[PDB]
Design a protein around this ligand. Structure first.
Ligand code: HEM
Ligand code: HEM
Ligand SMILES: CNCCCc1cccc(CCc2cc(C)cc(N)n2)c1
Ligand SMILES: CNCCCc1cccc(CCc2cc(C)cc(N)n2)c1
Ligand SMILES: C[C@H](O)[C@H](O)[C@H]1CNc2nc(N)[nH]c(=O)c2N1
Ligand SMILES: C[C@H](O)[C@H](O)[C@H]1CNc2nc(N)[nH]c(=O)c2N1
Ligand SMILES: [Zn+2]
Lengths: 409, 415
């Protein structure tokens, strides 16, 4: 079927044909929808049709479907799968696969940029020291003195499952979290477990509120190893407020480079368990979730107090006032330090434009409303009013288990 | 489908187990290859004899299970009396007790409603003896006055006769009992509520004389027994309204905003045991954001962010200053303050969502689940600083239920 999606603000109706091409499951059925579940539920024989499908859409994308080059590649991949229990992507294929996995990421609001992605091939890597060198170069390239540039670094694909390359950090750059005797938590509570694994591995914690975690790198199934990122490569921003001169005294900072390192890139049936990728921040990521989640840095009440707000009744919306002021500060700080950042109004605007683009040239755009709508001021951004269809296209980024649950030393 | 499904809360790590989904009765719109969770709405004939039997049995069984009389003499006797009735008259009539049970459970089952902690406290008015539009008018006035209660609002539903052959439907043509008119001007601007322009034009055609103001209460347009609909003015003393003022900004009063106290949906269809109640207006009380964020600040609605931002002396040329966000909070502070001051029941989105989490947890324990539509349950401002944002939810359709239905002017055969 052709499916329609309506924007209820503009009455614009788009027509989705692209969904007919998906094979992977969403988790929903005709009787139960799991649209708000965060994580719902290879061999020679499995591997070839997947390989064939990806190769097919690649040569289709470059308008050479059924070409001699196409036929040979199909033949080449078959004999290699047969003889080696796997196969290797051409460079052009790797780049195409990585850009399209971003393009297909239904939960990403930043996808208007999908084709501007710098791809670093690290499939010749064999050691954690190698991984560290590769990741350092990535961080340096992507940070670019504040003029952030999208990048992905791709390490060797999974083979027998026992020689996995893994970045054990969930992001390349995050702040430590410490469990106080107090019972309270210093730093970022989200990272308390990982911080303790690093300490247990020999890392000497400064026990501060914003200590950059070391890299914990696993290469070829071996034990992971600790590395400190050279600090001149770690760009950070002191958060200050344009009208509240007391905001600086709060002592808040964040890092400029968002770099997810715990996901799995899947291309043509090949699995890349280590593929750190980075872009730039949407302000709410920091100002709403990182800072104001009860299970994170949880600063709302501190801020509302310096704002001298009545905090006795919820209906004074003191939390909503403090939240807006915090997010103003973050945007103002990054902008003032010339560090790339986008606000949720601009970002969601761009995404509606991107959707339109994708429907026009590709016949659809998979999108996850639950994730796309910003965590504050939802209905005054255009994506709130935009119906979206969610479905799974490959190449893709997938979740994988945390390494400390499968690996033994 | 698996017998046990798990939902997690990511803020509190609390995990809940759902078994109620097994009783799901029809389509969500989703398939295993595509999710339609953000789609708003995913023949003039009626249920046949053979279609009606198992639907009725299913409901009656469920009713007698709820009163701990499953398999009793009374249960089996009711089943037989219903069956005889469907067989000889092609339909059947609900007992008052079943009617009340069914309405309460349609609310309880309403996956998009955050106020369901209140579901068992619902005044049901049986208007199945109604025959004319004047009678519908009488019943609706009585509803409004009861539910309003001088500002101490009480949830209520009034239920008109069920559908028979489909050519004799009772319908309230209004989408809500109380709403403000909208008027398209020759120059393209809109006066009043742009959402209601179509319906307003219908009323005007039907004989209504429009004051052509910013907040004119619309008349009722009421259809009884499949006849042409008729106009009635709701007595203005029965329409409680709240002028919007702000605790700090004294200029806010000058914006001349007000809203009505009673939210009352009148265009949905109530389905009980396969019976179809096409006119079933129900009402509760407002969550502040419904008015402060959607009614006032949607671009296609009253759209007042700009005017408010101006009076707040905010820098409005860069989006990153968050001038829209700042004014939105203030508008919603005013709405809550104005309702509380006039002692009209209202709930803020923090209190409401926390109550719904408690409600949901209780439902999981006593009922084995609680269907919920995250896209609708999460508030339209400040989403992640409410507890429902972090709550995984399962969405599925149980019956009895409230359902959407075509707009009556689209289907009506004019006499
Ligand atoms: C360039 C600027 C970018 C912006 C502004 C952006 C924005 C976002 C945001 C706000 C989210 C929600 C994540 C959360 O709430 O935790 C997200 C998710 C995601 N992004 Fe993007 N992103 C950008 C670049 C990228 C790049 C370069 C990639 C990969 C090459 C990418 C892949 C993804 C994926 C796979 C998700 C889903 C996360 C999950 O399922 O956990 N994004 N993005
Ligand atoms: C008593 C206090 C109540 C509160 C605070 C409340 C709150 C809400 C809210 C905020 C919505 C979303 C509305 C929107 O965004 O348009 C909603 C939807 C809904 N409510 Fe409740 N409600 C209440 C009472 C009731 C009652 C008494 C019923 C039925 C007997 C009911 C049935 C529904 C239904 C069926 C929807 C679905 C909306 C749709 O799909 O169009 N509610 N409610
Ligand atoms: C269990 N989830 C693990 C991954 C969590 C995650 C995945 C992808 C993105 C994010 C948010 C961080 C981010 C990443 C990127 C590339 C850009 C951005 N603005 N923000 C978190
Ligand atoms: C397509 N229109 C169908 C009805 C739209 C609608 C249904 C249910 C609720 C609402 C919002 C009004 C409302 C009703 C009730 C009972 C309570 C409340 N807080 N708010 C709109
Ligand atoms: C329960 C729900 O799935 C979960 O809280 C989601 C909701 N939407 C989100 N949206 C974004 N962008 N990021 C998130 O982490 C989440 N969390
Ligand atoms: C496209 C999207 O489903 C639509 O804008 C929804 C989003 N969530 C909503 N949530 C509520 N409570 N009410 C609404 O009208 C909507 N609109
Ligand atoms: Zn779904």
């Amino acid at each position: 079927r052709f499916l329609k999606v309506k924007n209820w603000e503009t009455e614009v109706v788009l027509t989705d044909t692209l969904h007919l091409k998906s094979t992977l499951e969403t988790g929903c059925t005709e009787y139960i929808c799991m649209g708000s579940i965060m994580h719902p539920s290879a061999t020679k024989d499995q591997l070839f049709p997947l390989a064939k499908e990806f190769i097919d859409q690649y040569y289709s994308s470059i308008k050479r479907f059924g070409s001699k080059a196409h036929m040979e590649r199909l033949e080449e991949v078959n004999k290699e799968i047969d003889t080696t229990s796997t196969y290797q992507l051409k460079d052009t294929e790797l780049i195409y696969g990585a850009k399209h996995a971003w393009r297909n990421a239904s939960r990403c609001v930043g996808r208007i940029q999908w084709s501007k992605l710098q791809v670093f091939d690290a499939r010749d890597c064999t050691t954690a020291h190698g991984m560290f060198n590769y990741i350092c170069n990535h961080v340096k390239y992507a940070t670019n003195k504040g003029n952030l540039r999208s990048a992905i670094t791709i390490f060797p694909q999974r083979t027998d499952g026992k020689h996995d390359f893994r970045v054990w950090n969930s992001q390349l750059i995050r702040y430590a979290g410490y469990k106080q005797p107090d019972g309270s938590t210093l730093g970022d509570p989200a990272n308390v477990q990982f911080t303790e694994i690093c300490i247990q591995q020999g890392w000497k914690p400064p026990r501060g509120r914003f200590d950059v975690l070391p890299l914990l790198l696993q290469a070829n199934g071996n034990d992971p190893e600790l590395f400190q990122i050279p600090p001149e490569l770690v760009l950070e921003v002191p958060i200050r407020h344009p009208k509240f001169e007391w905001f600086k005294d709060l002592g808040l900072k964040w890092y400029g480079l968002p770099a997810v390192s715990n996901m799995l890139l899947e291309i043509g049936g090949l699995e890349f368990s280590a593929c750190p990728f980075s872009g730039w921040y949407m302000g709410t990521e920091i100002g709403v979730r990182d800072y104001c989640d009860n299970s994170r840095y949880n600063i709302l009440e501190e801020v509302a107090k310096k704002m001298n707000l009545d905090m006795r009744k919820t209906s004074s919306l003191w939390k909503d006032q403090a939240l807006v002021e915090i997010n103003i500060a973050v945007l103002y700080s990054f902008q003032s330090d010339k560090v790339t950042i986008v606000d949720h109004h601009s970002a969601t605007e761009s995404f509606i434009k991107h959707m339109e683009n994708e429907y026009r040239c590709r016949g659809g755009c998979p999108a996850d409303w639950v994730w796309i709508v910003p965590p504050m001021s939802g209905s005054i951004t255009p994506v709130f009013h935009q119906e979206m269809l969610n479905y799974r296209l490959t190449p893709s980024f997938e979740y994988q288990p945390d390494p400390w649950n499968t690996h033994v030393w």
